[PDB]
Curated annotation (Swiss-Prot):
Record organism: Homo sapiens (Human)
Name of this chain's protein: Lysozyme C
UniProt record similarity statement: Belongs to the glycosyl hydrolase 22 family.
Enzyme Commission designation: 3.2.1.17
Top class in the EC scheme: hydrolase
Length: 130
């Protein structure tokens, strides 16, 4: 499903993402925006290393979820990658909290460094009443 902006902000808020491991909701919103355009069915295959990025947060199949076809898969979220293509994002959120418990935190997603780090990101949550 493609979320509307404030719709996603309140859903993430309800699921405990605001200030999770010090990360504001606006930073999580900036990340989903640039990773998938808030689209839960987004997939991106990475031909160079044979892995795929799944869902609204574009979580990768080498380290986090298992799709069975990625070389060297670790499956740290202990989740099938199909769980990240559901309309309900509760599993994607539980795996995203797992990613940022690593020292790197949200810096684990390159797109957050390129488009969100050291930028004003308050516009992603403005007017959502969150």
């Amino acid at each position: 499903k493609v979320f509307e902006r404030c719709e996603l902000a309140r859903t993430l808020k309800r699921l405990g993402m605001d200030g999770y491991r010090g990360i504001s909701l606006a930073n999580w919103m900036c990340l989903a925006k640039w990773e998938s355009g808030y689209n839960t069915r987004a997939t991106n295959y990475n031909a160079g290393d044979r892995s795929t990025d799944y869902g609204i947060f574009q979580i990768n199949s080498r380290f986090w979820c298992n799709d069975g076809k990625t070389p060297g898969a670790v499956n740290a979220c202990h989740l099938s990658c199909s769980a990240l293509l559901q309309d309900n994002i509760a599993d994607a959120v539980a795996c995203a909290k797992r990613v940022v418990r690593d020292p790197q935190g949200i810096r684990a997603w390159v797109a957050w460094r390129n488009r969100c780090q050291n930028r004003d990101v308050r516009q992603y949550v403005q007017g959502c009443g969150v």
